[PDB]
Subunit: 422 residues, 4 copies
């Protein structure tokens, strides 16, 4: 029965053709949904009660579109998101962190506009986790956004939006200096021929997967759901194909910001992503990611590949990782394990930001410290297990891979352990 | 010999990649498609696309198959639609550069437990009006196909039956349905109501894979460019859907309300044409051909053996085309199953086979009507040169190009056993 | 039949990994195919008798090597005459006649920088006596090959030059030597003295791989069955060495003292024949063909394009043979480079080409002696039928087998362009 | 280039020219062959063990010391010749030569003692002489038994029964010497600790031209099972009378190592030949060259794909450690082992990194020579009061011996494999450590 669920017969196939032939509509997904959902906040999704329903439906990142509304409007949106998120903090083992992302207006006819400098400063002052930088055309555009965030905003992630021919052509230099990329298909589909957008999307997703950096697929994914309760056949296909391409995040714009069915749009993306993740051909995917990733003398990099290899060998239910900045969880995520990467962190910001990496489930550790560091480590590992059992990731008898470091502080991950649950 | 510019077009750097990941990374928006569009476009005929003048524009835009939806309209209405399609098609008989055969497909209303009374009458109408294809609605088991086959009476056994998979039972009994059908249509509209909407992509990808493995045509249908019923440009999800259906391995892509009742039927055909061309160049032939090769069982049928040898030869020299002589379309279909990058120019004396080969990806039919030569080998050479001269006229070929020529050792269907490498003079 | 798929290591050949392939090797799986790796026997006092040479031809000797390091021109002329007398004693039965090449192995440069004066005299002797191949000793650079070519003069243009790599400089300048040579010999005797003995296997495997990639013949030579000079059976290391040279990809295997001066020259040839047959069935064609196909560059040469198409077609139907008409042996060589499992039966009128094609693995030469038919297409058909009748007589073919037939569109060398699937009747 | 560029800048182009690294990074087996370089020197320690047969030519304590220095890892006693008194003196001479180097524990080399039985002869099962010889082996503390002419699983059960309750730790390596042994191979391997391809008798029992098929098949199946396989007989035969081997003999040794043999053997070459030490030196030289020429890229992928999924933490830690070692070009994998099992599970994935096995068991240290790439270190220190400190001391002993023998240098990365509690069967931890 275990080997009939989550497309396991299709995953064991020797060729991609055989894998496609073995896909079964009756094979139910069992793993937790790995691809994060970014929902744009607007009139249709601004109330605290509506936001609680969207968090329950699967929203992981709240997007504020600074192309519309005043700073006062966005500050109220941020406050409503935080109020809805903290209404579930009473149960720490099931609490779900939600990242706040600021999408800039852009340069327009102009480098960095004066409105963008003011909006970026607003973001730092209001503690946003991510910036979706509009119309990035070169590496210097990223440096300008980084400078406008100042010294108080060093920790904010910059996701560069590729929206035109120049951004596509200078992609490598942009990715090198960015934390991740957004395939902004709306403007891209106007700037380049509409029939070429799929080539740009597939290329950028592939290069981001190669680099181990987050990639977001955005715009018109479930467009008809702005007015209709069910999407079209092309829309469900689009969401499934973005997940199959290798997108870490999928986004909703008007579907959540102004549409009549914002919660239903989030539920639909959740349902499709789960089905598409089970249909991923891990046999060739892991081999290609493994082969393409360069040799490394960094112990976090070395422990990550060893842990993902160990997880596949035993069909581990999860990889529990201790992370300060989210980096150790990101290096596990780049190898696309089938096992959930449960990231136990004390940093509330890192817990929100790791939603950018596919298959990373953040757990914000709010338990008292232990005097002995070794006891403190084991306690964070046990917290990971208890929250995993509560959320359905783990059961007694399961095997897990535990990834820790040899000394406190970020940058010292070097240990992988095989642990039997209970 | 060919130049650096040649190897930068039609995603050739991405096609030469050693891994699928590298192939994706090398896809270039500046790499222009050069080959002719190989995925056929099926357009549904209705009030928005019924006039002879409108049909001429749709033929010019790229329509290869005209679909008549028997769920609406009378026999008199559909007979007028058929006559208008044939009039628009025959208006280009004077120009060899513009003439293109167009298949006529009858989509049945559907079942009740088995074949309905109206379906029996509509199938009979199809035989009487010389339709080429039947899109059989709600096929659930092999006996449903046998009923449609029996209804195609004594005169209609040459009509192709494309079974529409629209429900859970059709998906579950897929192998037995495909075995007795000529091809499959992934009818996503009803399938998306019968099974959870989020599972349709699994059924589509599975059916396309199994049809590619069997070497039988597969059509992807419904809501591909839905928003173009009222808007002049499609959404980002719609262009993605068309591209992904072509990348999945669909032989045909379809337009329903977009052409039957929408405000932009010609623009919807142009959009599918443009996306299919881009997606065909992005196909990863290196692994695709190896997997089609490995999955296909060993064969002692000379047509099947010649076809794989010809596709291998075409890839080795970057052949501009594979010219094949075919009476039933079978030789062109067996070439098409290996997904060559070279166009398969099928020269035939059968008008029906010329229309029906539009079901197979990459087959470009040429109807030959010259009186037969007394010496058979001269008749063969005349048809081979007809294919070369038409290929030059349409832009597929130039002097100095290499073509692969597929023929048999004696006249009559079923004896293909020869593959020649010819230099265009 | 099930019995067919149990023989010639077919279960091991169908394996998905090389590890599974090794695990499926069966000592009870008997080889069925004809032995494809040629045996070169060095001629000497133990193998000069016309009666002894007839037994060696029957045992499997394909090339007779004359070592010009020993004996006078008078001695070698008598060796040539004895070989030709033994070879021609079987010419009364043209369907079973076996051509035998004569190769001249030069003395070498010695302490000198380039071509010695004795080598110039020996090379002219070879041209005057009609030798087919030259095994050029101690080739260190491309200019050494050019000097051998110049010493053969205008009359020795058709002689094949196989460069012997016997020292560190030859290994280091391998690419430039292979580019100008017709093939290579891994001369392990001197190589094992010039470089550390424990590194010879790396040089052998490297040179065989590069020759396989270039599609040029490679010979593995020296001490393969050394103990058989005095003992009737070889050691376990010796049989392993022969099997591994064949598995590495050697086109030819050689006997030196074993045939020139030993007590068991016929048995040494029989032993190499027996081992080579077993090792050829154990070749993992699934990965080998895929890698040869992938590594070979794209080509606009019709012989090159037809060869890959014909090898692909032969694998698709498990063809018993590929019958090829050739004037210079080039069409058979281009088939051979893809390492088909099917025997390459080469029909030629050139007695020299028939002898020289023994350098290419899996090429079985048939010398056609009939004067031409007035109609060229009938002359082509008669030769193809001669190929089939010889194949049936020798055990390569049976009624019901499938064969691939490779021919050209006009007479003369260089115009091969047709591949045909034929059923044996 | 991009997948090795940063590591090439760090370790240097000279690092990536040695030990056939350009050939190992090739995308196809054809390219791998084309890139083999005679100028690419082997850097790693020799990982295929050498078994030398002891006889009149190699019996003296002084001769045995030279053979230990030349590379002998296992001493074979052929019970087809000589009395129990003769073999007891051979055992005593081997132990005396081995212990003459015990003064330096960081460089001491353990040597296993193997008893090769006479066989059943005309009989159906275990002979009476075999029962007496097997009892002699237990009484004299032999580490391994090479059981002659094993034809079915019941033959190995009989050998195990004849070893009694005191010989439970002795490894049984079944010799496949005839058609029946080849045909019933799977049932024999299942109950044996390993296999020996006994080519001498096999080459008489089956056609000589088919022995290579049996050798390659058995080596492949043993590699798949993760059990030791020995290639034996006539490997360097001409060295019985000549100082240098033939071209076929060096080729045979190299091909046995390339096939996947854990051990290579010398019979008459050491037992009665004129050049026993030179024969050991030649096998050492060839094995080093052949190990560097192994195509790890496809080999590791095939061993991973063929090995079934496992819920055993030792099994899971071993594959994770070998994957980690390949990612950073680790100089070694240091493993703590009681029975040798954890080192054996690392060895089955054929890492390029040396598997330095630290053990307190003198028998396990001798027996791990059966597994390719396992370098045993016998730890003689008394236990620390705190178990975690005792573990750390053992790991440091592995690093210090590794630096002393040339396996490790400051700046190298090492993979350390340990367990969570004392006793055999609890290996579950993999650590990446930088050598200081
Ligand atoms: O899982 S993968 O290894 N799939 C590789 C893959 C994909 C396409 C092709 S193919 O050669 O395009 C092809 C298409 C149809 C039938 C065929 O026989 C072959 C061959 C191999 C993969 C590798 C990547 O690097 C990537 O970014 C995405 C995916 C992927 C994952 C799951 C899917 O369902 C599809 C693609
Ligand atoms: O080293 S390997 O990865 N090589 C695999 C391998 C071996 C042979 C072939 S092959 O297809 O026979 C080939 C391809 C190209 C050129 C040739 O001359 C031969 C393809 C791939 C290997 C993989 C295994 O899983 C294994 O158990 C053993 C060996 C191996 C051992 C000894 C050899 O001589 C060769 C390979
Ligand atoms: O993922 P990051 O940011 O590198 O953090 C991983 C770190 O977490 C730890 O496991 C625990 O460290 P802390 O005690 O500081 O929380 C470290 O040993 C390791 O370096
Ligand atoms: O594709 P089909 O229907 O099998 O037709 C292929 C047939 O066409 C030919 O190439 C030419 O035949 P005709 O001259 O009868 O048209 C035959 O040799 C071959 O058998
Ligand atoms: O392999 P080669 O030397 O190029 O010979 C191939 C030639 O043999 C043929 O098949 C037969 O030609 P001939 O009639 O001259 O023998 C030609 O069509 C072809 O060009
Ligand atoms: O390889 P084996 O025989 O299973 O031994 C591995 C064992 O060695 C250890 O690392 C250390 O154990 P000891 O302290 O008993 O020597 C254990 O944690 C582990 O179970
Ligand atoms: O800004 C965006 O997200 C776009 O243009 O698609
Ligand atoms: O009938 C159709 O085409 C459907 O249901 O999708
Ligand atoms: O010359 C040779 O044949 C040799 O040196 O091996
Ligand atoms: O007994 C043996 O060792 C043999 O036959 O090789
Ligand atoms: K914006
Ligand atoms: K209908
Ligand atoms: K010579
Ligand atoms: K014995
Ligand atoms: Mg935009
Ligand atoms: Mg329907
Ligand atoms: Mg020499
Ligand atoms: Mg024996």
């Amino acid at each position: 029965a275990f080997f009939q669920q989550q497309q396991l017969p299709a995953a064991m196939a020797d060729t991609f053709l055989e894998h496609l032939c073995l896909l079964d509509i009756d094979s139910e997904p069992v793993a937790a949904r790995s691809t994060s959902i970014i929902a744009t906040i607007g009139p249709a999704s601004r109330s605290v009660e509506r936001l609680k329903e969207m968090i329950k439906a699967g929203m992981n990142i709240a997007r504020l579109n600074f192309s519309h509304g005043s700073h006062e409007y966005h500050a109220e949106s941020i406050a409503n998101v935080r109020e809805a998120v903290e209404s579930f903090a009473g149960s720490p083992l099931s609490y779900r962190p939600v990242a706040i992302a600021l999408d800039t207006k852009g340069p327009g006819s102009g480098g960095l506009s004066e409105q963008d400098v003011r909006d970026l400063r607003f973001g730092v002052e209001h503690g946003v986790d991510i910036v979706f930088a509009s119309f990035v055309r070169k590496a210097s555009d990223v440096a300008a956004v980084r400078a406008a965030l100042g010294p108080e905003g060093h920790g904010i992630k910059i996701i560069s939006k590729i929206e035109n021919h120049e951004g596509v052509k200078r992609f490598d230099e942009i990715l090198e200096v960015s934390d991740g990329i957004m395939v902004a298909r709306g403007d891209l589909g106007i700037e380049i021929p509409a029939e070429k957008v799929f080539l740009a999307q597939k290329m950028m997703i592939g290069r981001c997967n190669l680099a181990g950096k987050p990639v977001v697929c955005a715009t018109q994914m479930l467009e008809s759901m702005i007015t209709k309760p069910r999407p079209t056949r092309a829309e469900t296909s689009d969401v499934a194909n973005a997940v199959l391409d290798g997108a870490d995040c999928i986004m909703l714009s008007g579907e959540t910001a102004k549409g009549n069915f914002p919660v239903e749009a989030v539920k639909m993306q959740h349902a499709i992503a789960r089905e598409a993740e089970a249909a991923v051909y891990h046999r060739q995917l892991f081999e290609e990611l493994r082969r393409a990733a360069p040799l490394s003398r960094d112990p976090t990099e070395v422990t990550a590949i060893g842990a993902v290899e160990a997880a596949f060998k035993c069909c581990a239910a999860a990889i529990i990782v201790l992370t300060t900045t989210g980096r150790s969880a990101q290096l596990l995520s780049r190898y696309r394990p089938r096992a959930a990467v449960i990231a136990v962190t004390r940093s509330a910001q890192a817990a929100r930001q790791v939603h950018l990496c596919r298959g990373v489930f953040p757990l914000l550790y709010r338990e008292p410290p232990e005097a002995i560091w070794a006891d403190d480590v084991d306690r964070r590992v046990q917290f990971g297990i208890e929250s995993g059992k509560l959320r359905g990731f783990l059961r007694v008898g399961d095997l897990v891979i535990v990834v820790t470091g040899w000394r406190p502080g970020s940058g010292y991950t070097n240990i992988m352990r095989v642990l039997s649950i209970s």
